[PDB]
RNA sequence: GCCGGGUGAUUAGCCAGGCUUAAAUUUAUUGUCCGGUUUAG
């Protein structure tokens, strides 16, 4: 998120070469014509294009019941079998949780995500905070995530690691600048909650892409809206 | 909770004169109303009534303590993998708590799967003991159940 | 006695020398450096008068406090050659890092593991080391002091305090058959027998616990590593043989240059830029001079290291 | 092409159709011989509409360059993908569900064997319990 | 103020009451958030990125200035 | 088998055209004006 005096190093096709050589060259032209048209764009349109979104691998660490585990998730489709008790749901909230900053970081900078509950951290006695990190690979792009909170009556400080969500959030602002009708990842998420959401106002009259990405979660007034848009 | 204070009282007795202190109480209570109006008069309503209850004294062989040890090991036949479960009282409130293996766990973090249980077989055994006062052993009532 | 040997080498009065032990804490200077990337890094750096002062304080308490030798970081004769030795002739490669290393220090450890050494100091003596060595940040109402980087007397101060952490470590490594090193706030492991690596996350968080109550584990940037892949300490490259080398995209690169030298196409400021370049990979190889005379020849190769 | 992918999971149906009320709107389906309205339907069938029909709305808001909406990129979360279904339904959920939307990332949590039978050993993971050390802990392994 | 027109003179007072709820709140408790401009009041053109508001207040010689401002959804910068 | 890694030699040379070799699912190269290391004036 730095203009930078674009350091030579090597060469390389990286994307973010390509968006550090954009920003780069923006600090000098003024006329958006010429921006619009430049070869630097198209570079980062089309590699933007290419690559494929998928998450990577993940590990949880003194998370509910879960001690200290690492899984590496296909790219199409994975399945996870056991019977009650084993921890089915926590992965699938550890992933919710992660993919939460990412979400708020698309809509406005420096905003806030999702935090762990106090009662989520393991009951053993000699634990002290829980920790969850995630990567995400954008073909030859890596991205790594860490989101952590200290027991309560503790005295000892944590922090959280967010640079990576916020530069690859950081691209996705840029090129929906320049870019008519840019398209953004899809994230969802449908909890056992959703048995009576369909099981159980002033009238819209403007939708956009954004309207879906005010929660992560599938829940009430969704299905209303889905008649609305039909 | 209100079965598990009967419990306690009748368990650890000491009560002595129970019915003459709620009365003692509930004459307090009228000196310092004479000293929401309504609802002073039906707290004291209340501790009549509680004077009575403790006047009558059935103790019966099906006494609070006996009802309290059934329920609670009517819920554990259902979940073998628990050891035990209390109802602790702190910060002025009660909680229930209940072991596995090696960790306590309140109500609140156990899983969906045990939840459904423990929720339908409480409800079970609530209205057979209401229903049923006068029955040696109240889980032999007669009725109809439907479940989908 | 520190205070008096301080006064008489730098020729201070009473008067000049209270002003400025209550205002050292206060003399440094914030700015932001350039990242290889995108992004930037802050850095905090001291005045002028107070870092050659700093300077004699450390020349004072080195040779009074024990360093670990594992530690190969700011140590005379020690540098990234002789850590990537350690782990030339080994299979599977273990690395981790710390999280905030530097600004957990604080004046509350630093004089604890001083006490434990058995230098008794008097209060004046403390009072001055304190207001001397540390940063305050924030307002003045914040009373903390932390170390920071960018200071001369911070490198050394690291390594004296972790030395209880280095000693426990190697010799339960050593009984495991498990070759340990620690750089700066990095750490790595490596062993030949497989299935063993996967134990010490634990141990090691166990021992920061018991060692030096503050540091915490950085969980994002663990690495495992075998022979089937890219493998590298700190900088240099090692192969599947068991040699040191510095990059096969580097000797390209240098290759290329050279040879657009001998063209006559390359600008001043390259040619100084490039030189250093081969002095630090012929120490790292011992015979990257070889190779390019064998190609090039003796005489191009000589006019271009004593052109400018 | 939304009416056509809500009905590719509801084989029984014929079609749909948006009768304007006089009050208001309402859809009107067709099992057999006979109309049914939305209210009326059973809990598997409300599960399939609103499932599917969320995604398709998810895709074409966020995919509108694309000639097909349906072959955006992202992530999707799945729990007890077996609630309210027949076991007749459960042999072939997962292989729909993977052919209409094929560039989006599916993680699913399931509970019956019936799901275990249609799916690769490569994208299996069960999860165990091992005391080891002293510890009781949690490990996944592949089939 | 005087004058027909589409745009409606009552849009001139609202911008004025949004000013000085934040004058109120604080004065009832330090850093008390007032009102904001939530996000459909910002035109719907296609060249435009914010909305700002700008006010002044005098007492004899002494002077304040507050501005207020809110950027559109998916912005490059924030405001 | 396959794929991904290591690189001496190769070319108006950071691209490419060849020969070798390595393997549990398992690296995607970093911070200067301070500190110590290398080379020079
Ligand atoms: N703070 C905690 N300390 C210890 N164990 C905990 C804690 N919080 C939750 N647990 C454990 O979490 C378990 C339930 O986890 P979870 O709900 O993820 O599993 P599940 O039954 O597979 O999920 P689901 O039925 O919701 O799909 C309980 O058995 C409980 O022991």
């Not at chain 2, 109303?33 to 009534?49: A, H």
Request: hydrophobic share 40%; glycine share 4%; proline share 3%.
């Amino acid at each position: 998120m730095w203009s930078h005096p674009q350091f030579e190093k090597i060469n390389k096709m990286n994307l973010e070469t390509c968006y550090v050589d954009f920003l780069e060259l923006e600090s000098h032209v003024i006329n958006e014509d010429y921006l619009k048209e430049s070869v630097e764009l198209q570079k980062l349109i089309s590699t933007l294009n290419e690559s494929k979104f998928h998450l990577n691998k993940i590990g949880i660490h003194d998370f509910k019941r879960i001690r200290e585990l690492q899984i590496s998730l296909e790219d199409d489709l994975t399945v996870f079998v056991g019977d009650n008790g084993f921890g089915k749901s926590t992965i699938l909230d550890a992933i919710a949780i992660v993919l939460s900053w990412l979400r708020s970081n698309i809509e406005k900078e420096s905003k806030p995500g999702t935090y762990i509950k106090s009662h989520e951290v393991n009951n053993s006695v000699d634990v002290e905070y829980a920790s969850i990190d995630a990567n995400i690979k954008l073909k030859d792009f890596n991205t790594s995530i860490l989101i952590t909170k200290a027991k309560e009556g503790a005295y000892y400080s944590r922090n959280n690691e967010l640079l990576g969500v916020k530069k690859l959030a950081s691209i996705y602002r840029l090129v929906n600048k320049y870019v008519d009708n840019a398209s953004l990842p899809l994230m969802a998420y449908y909890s056992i909650a959703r048995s009576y959401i369909g099981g159980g106002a002033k009238t819209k009259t403007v939708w956009s892409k954004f309207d879906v990405y005010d929660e992560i979660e599938f829940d009430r007034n969704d299905f209303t809206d889905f008649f609305q848009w039909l | 909770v209100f079965l598990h204070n009967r419990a306690s009282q009748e368990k650890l007795s000491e009560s002595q004169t129970t019915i003459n202190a709620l009365f003692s109480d509930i004459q307090s209570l009228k000196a310092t109303l004479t000293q929401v109006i309504k609802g002073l008069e039906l707290s004291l309503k209340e501790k009549l009534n509680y004077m009575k209850s403790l006047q009558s004294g059935e103790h019966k062989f099906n006494n609070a303590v006996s009802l309290y040890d059934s329920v609670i090991n009517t819920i554990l036949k259902f979940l073998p993998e628990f050891q035990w479960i209390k109802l602790v009282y702190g910060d002025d409130d009660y909680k229930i708590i209940l072991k596995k293996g090696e960790v306590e766990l309140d109500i609140q973090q156990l899983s969906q799967g045990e939840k459904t249980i423990f929720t339908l077989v409480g409800d079970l055994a609530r209205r057979l003991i209401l229903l049923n006062p006068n029955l040696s052993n109240p889980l032999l009532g007669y009725g109809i159940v439907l479940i989908d | 006695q520190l205070t008096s040997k301080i006064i008489s080498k730098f020729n201070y009065n009473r008067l000049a020398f209270q002003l400025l032990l209550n205002e050292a804490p206060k003399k440094y200077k914030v700015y932001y450096i350039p990242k290889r990337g995108a992004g930037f890094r802050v850095i905090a750096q001291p005045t002028k008068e107070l870092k050659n002062v700093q300077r004699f304080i450390v020349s004072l308490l080195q040779p009074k406090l024990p360093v670990h030798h594992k530690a190969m970081a700011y140590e005379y004769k020690k540098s990234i050659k002789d850590n990537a030795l350690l782990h030339k002739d080994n299979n599977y490669i273990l690395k981790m890092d710390f999280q905030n290393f530097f600004n957990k220090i604080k004046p509350d450890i630093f004089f604890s593991k001083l006490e434990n050494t058995g230098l008794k100091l008097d209060s004046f003596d403390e009072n001055t080391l304190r207001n001397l060595l540390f940063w305050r940040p924030g307002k003045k109402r914040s009373t903390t002091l932390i170390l920071s980087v960018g200071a001369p007397s911070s490198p050394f101060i690291s390594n004296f305090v972790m030395y209880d952490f280095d000693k426990s470590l190697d010799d339960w490594c050593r009984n495991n058959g498990i070759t340990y090193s620690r750089y700066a706030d990095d750490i790595t492991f490596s062993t030949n027998i497989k299935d063993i690596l996967c134990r010490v996350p634990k141990v090691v968080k166990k021992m920061l616990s018991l060692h030096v109550p503050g540091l915490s584990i950085n969980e994002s940037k663990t690495i495992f590593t075998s022979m089937a892949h890219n493998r590298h300490v700190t900088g240099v490259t090692l192969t599947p043989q068991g040699n040191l080398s510095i990059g096969r995209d580097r000797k390209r690169m240098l290759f290329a240059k050279i040879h657009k030298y001998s063209l006559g196409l390359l600008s001043s400021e390259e040619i100084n830029k490039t030189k250093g370049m081969i002095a630090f990979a012929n120490y790292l190889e011992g015979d990257f001079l070889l190779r390019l005379q064998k190609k090039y020849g003796c005489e191009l190769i000589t006019k271009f290291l004593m052109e400018g | 092409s939304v009416i056509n992918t809500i009905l590719k999971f509801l084989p029984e149906f014929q079609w749909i159709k948006l009768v304007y009320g006089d009050d208001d709107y309402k859809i009107i389906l067709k099992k057999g011989e006979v109309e049914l309205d939305i209210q009326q339907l059973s809990q598997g069938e409300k599960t399939i509409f609103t499932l599917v029909g969320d995604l398709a709305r998810r895709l074409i808001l966020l995919n509108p360059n694309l000639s097909n909406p349906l072959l955006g990129y992202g992530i999707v979360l799945i729990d007890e993908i077996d609630l309210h279904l027949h076991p007749q339904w459960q042999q072939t959920i997962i292989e729909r569900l993977t052919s209409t939307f094929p560039n989006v990332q599916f993680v699913i949590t399931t509970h019956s064997p019936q799901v275990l039978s249609t799916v690769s050993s490569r994208s299996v993971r069960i999860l165990q319990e091992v005391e080891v050390d002293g510890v009781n802990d949690l490990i996944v392994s592949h089939p």
